Amino acid sequence: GSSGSSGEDDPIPDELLCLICKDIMTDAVVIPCCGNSYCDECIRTALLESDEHTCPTCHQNDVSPDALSGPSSG
Ligand SMILES: [Zn+2]
Ligand SMILES: [Zn+2]
Known part of the structure; x- marks a missing residue:
């Protein structure tokens, strides 16, 4: 060996x-309803997926x- 970078x-x-x-x-966007980490889109689509805007967690x-926490209109 004697090369370096010995460690995972x-x-x-x-x-x-x-x-x-x-x-x-x-x-990162934290929802008020309950509070969770979801991709700017993940949380966006989710609300859509279900018949209406119904948070998955709660x-x-x-x-x-x-x-x-998105000042960029989402
Ligand atoms: Zn995601
Ligand atoms: Zn919720």
């Missing part, structure tokens, strides 16, 4: 991932989509 490391932890597609959340009714 752990990649981005789960805590830094969404509970939907498990993909880096370019724009059955909500019209969860303030703007409330999210």
Whole structure:
């Protein structure tokens, strides 16, 4: 050996991932209804998926989509 870089490391932890597609959340958004990490889109589509805007984590009714920590209109 005698080359270097002797040691295994752990990649981005789960805590830094969404509970939907498990993909880096370019724009972490925390929902008020309950509070969870979801991709700017993940949370966007979700609300759509269901008949109406009903948060997946906690059955909500019209969860303030703007409330999210996204000043870019979402
Ligand atoms: Zn996602
Ligand atoms: Zn919720």
